[PDB]
Design a binder for this molecule. Structure first.
Ligand SMILES: *C(C)[C@H]1/C(=C/c2[nH]c(/C=C3N=C(/C=C4\NC(=O)C(CC)=C4C)C(C)=C\3CCC(=O)O)c(CCC(=O)O)c2C)NC(=O)[C@@H]1C
Lengths: 162, 172, 162, 172, 162, 172, 162, 172, 172, 162, 162, 172
């Protein structure tokens, strides 16, 4: 899983080398930044439900046809809304994992790999999940470097959908 | 490969849960102790060559049959292969000390290593002796109280000990 | 050349990826540590001559035969001493380069590559240059993290000779 | 590959000199400005997809012959190849912004790229238009004064501009 | 370009072999089937405009939001409708090419390669072009084996979008 | 790889015999029915995407534990791998329908597939459910009496059923 | 085994693709041609003995030395003639297999592979088996496309011996 | 690789046009003549070995310096290489006769072949003689009016002649 | 790979001993007999083709089921594979005769050969018959007293016999 | 070209090594054996014409059909006999080259490479050239180790034809 | 193990060939040279102790610091002298093995492989073992080709240390 | 690769001639002188390390700019590369001395070496100095009249000189 530490180790184990000051500097940067990433992950976690419930409506307002059209890919049924809210939670939960781990690994492994195959097979439009990510990014209520960490991994998701 | 953070992540995903405070506090504490972990890794790495050499010199003093003709460490090709293994093991231990997790040590060094030493006929029990030779030397170096901000690294030095025993347990 | 930044870029250009928060944390750790590395490099540079001249004698005292034996590999001639002092300077100068760059690259490229072939061809004993590195490490007069950076790259040299 | 630090190192070694204060001050100042460099890299990277898309949309609005039948960006395979090139160029620019040196951009992207666009028959002058399209958009994003500690990044934004012009100069 | 003849040749040039009765049978099957494929291509070509203009409305009716929403990806502007009608023509024209050539090659080369990258970059939903292909398939007015050829290559497009 | 013709050939060669009329009549009849076989292959292939999707949608409706956190089809990488397997299986079935012989399905898909799903820990019994989901859908599509020269394909539809059961039997 | 159908499948399984109209046309050509190939195979089979017995004499007349010279490679003994007649039957039987299968596969697998090694090891001259194939080609009594199929696979054998 | 159909397709796409009747009639006529094309390909292929041999025998009768010591076809390795080239050329000609287009012959045989014969020092003008030797023999075989439904293949035999001259023009 | 000299070396090194006279005399005698060994190798090698052929001809005379339809040596591909195996075995025997040691024969031919003939279903007991067919023929050729300096090669001919039996023992 | 010296060099240049006593022993064996090989090559050369003219008749007697049958592959014409005598000379001349060079290289390069392709294309039976080689081997009038060298390379040719 | 015979076999088994006169000449050269190599190996073996004991002193005289300096790498202790004498014996014993085998194989396998790693790890200077090899080379008391064999393998060792 | 014998062979084959006595005498004389050639090869090879080292030491004494900072032999990687080239050149010279022909030296060392030293910017004129440094040292060693059967090797020592000049001529 891609974290600052596994990259530092991977770079050394690749060249057959022991760790060096080159790699330890990289991990010291992780340990320092962790203070800002943690409080971002804590906040997103504590306000996770209001952010999911608001993100779902931001989508149903922007794309109202998803609540009226027929088809298992749409949120026009109570089961479809449950599925959508679930997926939005999945995205938010991966953002917290990325902050806790210090890198994209969690999202890379659990979400981004296979995204295009699934979104196509099940006729899910990426525009929907980007709108939900834009709503979280605007309303997570973070400030300073805690917000820089959150948006970094939210924009990373958005670029994966674009 | 997992580190102490990715491990906790992988365990939450399996249950589909966000992290709880019990885990945000454990991981925050890990960060609080990062400087100690880096001194330890730096100290062992900067004495890698002496650790392996003195450990090799002592192994062959106690078990002189490894180096007499017909011994598994006889000839320079098997001596070098032996010093190499000692260096490779110490190298994946220092990886685990930095990751706070033994996964890299298991997948990429220890896993399958017992089967290897039995195919070529190497005394794994002697390899195990070599591994705990480096352990005592590395802890001595890592926990040296001189030229470093005083503090308690006893918890860390115990974790480091676990990685060595894990390695010597997998070959013996 | 192996620096924290070229590794961070190399890790991204390898997987075909844009940079990410995973890599930027690694460079932030370099920029932070630079404060301690710089003042170490400045000090070694300002006291470079006394450290070379003292390092040379530490060697001639430990291995006195290098000043009395015949052979172009020994310091028993004025030209041989010049060569030795030169080589000791080379080692110290690479240590400063490593501190300025933030990694082993300078020493890897300019010194460690080919060391075994040269030390064997010209019958130069590694024990000599390790003793000179041990004298610098003890007498560079650094304290705190400036000293941790210096010894990190001096021990890295010593391990390359061992 | 070189960065701003390794470059200065490589220039001292060629003359066999230790660094002078004139250089310890220049490199220390580079460090002082690192936070700005990281915001810039983060800001451009997190808007990579919109930069390439809007730049592509505008290139094909001004030069609609690139996308009509027989055009070099006609069919989806050449359209994708074109969007890809735009993404690849922007990717090696963001590498140079982080390294403070254009070496990676030259060796691994621009060098030989002019000869490539002439073999397959692509209008390099149109690629150059695309590159300065992303330049204006990226600087707008990187230098956005909103949601960030106020300060002067004008020097940085000029360096970033140099990398784009360097790329558009190598293809045009 | 993938046709029955280039495959037959490719299979021989691959194994270093001259053509054989194995391959000539394959081309005889192309020459025979051509009678049904040609009259399909002729018909689609002669009624190409009514099929494009009807296919466009089938889409604007099924997904009415494409005519009212703001964004360069939608048909809510006269330029956007021109683009959509153009794309629908492209699909139909590739179907005729596939019938004339005797295989998927034309569509493979000119349309399917890069489809996912373009449809994602420009936020074009595959559901739109499948609906346009379903309207053509129902209303091309072909019967018998001429219709079997047309639907074969129209469904092949639809599967590429699914 | 064998087809219905090469299979009969391989069985005559083993006995060193020319073909008998009993076999020239069986193979001539196979030819008589070729058009049906081609409609069947065309019909299933042109609905591959809907067959796999609707079959996947129904499998996960009946067995929702495959898609909850910790499930074998949880995350997009395992979901895609699962949809892929369903597509790959349906692909080698349509090969067998065209060859009139299951050899390609056995050598290049089913053989060793049971051992694979047990190494990675996939519920082969769930894969078997998916396979007979596509079976019922494919036969419905292949045997649809609409828009096609009326006739009896019951024998063919039974052969097609054999290939699916063969696949679901090899994994369950 | 190389038949029109296994090639069509092989071409698809190679590129990871489902079958397409490109490949089904190739098999339709096999099914059509089968009518002419079958009646050729039936005829060669029904008159197989007279064609072998006549083919053997065509050889013993053209190369009379094969019936008078000493050596296990010649037909100067009753066991040698049995072997020759056997080999001639083998060739004819492979021709029928090729017609039944629709391609060279049977002959490729069972006869052509290793032909040069065997004909050299056992000092069998290819001129002998070509003469036997020329006699069959002239006297099989086929007309029209049934004859075109037979000669196609008989000449294919002859080219393998040349 | 292109055939007569894919070529017309590629030319319409470049202009973004559907096909016109002028082209639906030309391609329909090509189909009308397919049986002749197949007889021609079958006839030349089934006499490949005699075509190359008799052509080789005659080339070395007219130019006996190619086979005397020091000649480019002296020794068995260069004789075989020479017979091989003749076979390879005739093989890509029969490909073009089946495709109705010379593209495969150009990309995969002739293109760069002149530069090759000048590097190793082979008389390309002698290769050209060999190529038109096989041409006359192949046309004789393909246009043989015996044992085949009578008709006019003069247009076809002219096309076949074009492929041979194209090959002998590219080496001479 | 070892020869008679390297073998003795490897056995002294294991005990860390210099060679004794008992070994300097045995190896000096080996040298004294080298000319015989070379005649033997030359004689068998220069009749390799006849040895394999006549041995094959006789094997198929005694066991005509190997060559009737369905037999393991039926078809030319399995006949050639069979003649090949006979040639390959005789080739590694002549290697052992020259090395004075069977190591090359074991590591690079016989080791694992029994498992191979059982996977493909070949009668190893028939291979064993073929091997001792070549043995009797090779000894006849090697020990032929005609056209060669008279002397005793009985010891050598016994060693050669050991290599063949070793091979036929490893497959039977 | 495969000689004892080029093999000794090839073995060293392969492993990146200087020559060693291992390789020089191999060349000393060549220089010694050269005395017996030279006088064999000299003899074959001096009696080359009688050996070719006798070898040709040994063939025309064993296979009399080669002088009466029609075909450019046979010696039934004055041009065909010239060709045969030429080929027999070629074989003998390569034997002398092999003795002069100390190995098979000359014959490997100039004769054996492509032998099977040529003998098949031109319908030349290997039995003919083996009989000519058997006549030379019996009548070259060499004794002792000079004869061992000649037969070594003549049998090597025969095995290449078998 | 690299001997003249294993090279001759290796060269044949590499190209898939039977042995030839090219390779047998190489082994005849080994069998001939063996007479001079054997008596060299016998002599070195019979006077092995005086040559080791004299070689040890040649070293302790040239590099007297090895008997007075502290460290497990030096001969300043009775255990260190035992180790040195042992190593010198090892070198001499490998020289005899090389003479008995006819090539470098014994020394390559048992001594040269890993020499640089061991000499560096244990801080053993190659200058020491070269001096011991120079003393043996001067005092082995061999003459003629027996001496040429001994020095060939002693210089080969020296070059491996240089 | 050619040696003195294979070269004469290749020249006779081109004219289709048997060898004449003029050539059987020249090659017989070459054999007569083989022992000298072997002493020469042995003597140079057994002093390879000292030849390269002393030659390197002297080159850098005369041209100290090759080893000062910025010089082409500055740093250990370029010093080693330089010592390597000297060793590689001396290695292919000793090959030519044994083959009696420069072909191996030309094809596998010198050919293209001038173009290489100009791409990386190495002073070929300095390489040429190094090559004739080893020449004088090697001839001194090879022609040393001590401890060897007295005789005239002047012809041989001249041939050896030709190989060195050939190498130094190809780089200068
Ligand atoms: C011109 C080359 C000479 C010639 C050709 C010719 N043939 C026909 C008719 C047919 N040719 C074929 C051949 C094939 N169809 C296949 O699928 C295959 C490969 C498996 C082959 C080889 C066939 C089937 C026919 C139809 C049946 C028949 O025998 O008639 C014609 C008449 C035109 C037509 O297309 O029917 C001609 C002219 N005849 C000559 O005189 C030319 C020298």
């Amino acid at each position: 899983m891609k974290t600052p530490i596994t990259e530092a180790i991977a770079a050394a184990d690749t060249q057959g080398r022991f760790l060096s000051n080159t790699e330890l500097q990289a991990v010291d940067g992780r340990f320092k930044r962790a203070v800002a990433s943690m409080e971002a992950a804590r906040a997103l976690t504590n306000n996770a439900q209001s952010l999911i419930d608001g993100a779902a409506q931001a989508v149903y307002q922007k794309f109202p046809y998803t609540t009226t059209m027929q088809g298992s890919q749409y949120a026009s049924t109570p089961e479809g809304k449950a599925k959508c809210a679930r997926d939005i939670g999945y995205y938010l939960r991966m953002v917290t994992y990325c902050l806790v781990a210090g890198g994209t690994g969690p999202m890379d492994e659990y979400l981004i790999a296979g995204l295009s195959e699934i979104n196509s097979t099940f006729d899910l439009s990426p525009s929907w999940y980007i709108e939900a990510l834009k709503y979280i990014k605007a309303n997570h209520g973070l400030t300073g470097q805690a917000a820089v960490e959150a948006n970094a991994y939210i924009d990373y998701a958005i670029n994966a959908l674009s | 490969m997992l580190d102490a953070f990715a491990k906790v992540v992988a365990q939450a995903d399996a249950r589909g849960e966000f992290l709880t405070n019990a885990q945000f506090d454990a991981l925050s504490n890990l960060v609080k102790e990062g400087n100690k972990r880096l001194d330890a890794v730096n100290r062992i790495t900067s004495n890698a060559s002496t650790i392996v050499a003195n450990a090799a010199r002592a192994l062959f003093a106690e078990q002189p049959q490894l180096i007499q003709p017909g011994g598994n460490a006889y000839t320079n090709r098997r001596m070098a292969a032996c010093l190499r293994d000692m260096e490779i093991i110490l190298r994946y231990v220092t990886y685990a000390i930095l990751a706070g997790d033994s996964s890299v040590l298991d997948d990429r060094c220890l896993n399958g290593l017992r089967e290897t030493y039995q195919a070529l006929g190497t005394p794994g029990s002697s390899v195990a002796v070599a591994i705990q030779k480096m352990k005592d030397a590395a802890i001595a170096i890592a926990n040296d109280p001189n030229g470093i901000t005083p503090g308690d690294c006893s918890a860390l030095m115990s974790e480091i000990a676990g990685y060595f025993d894990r390695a010597a347990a997998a070959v013996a």
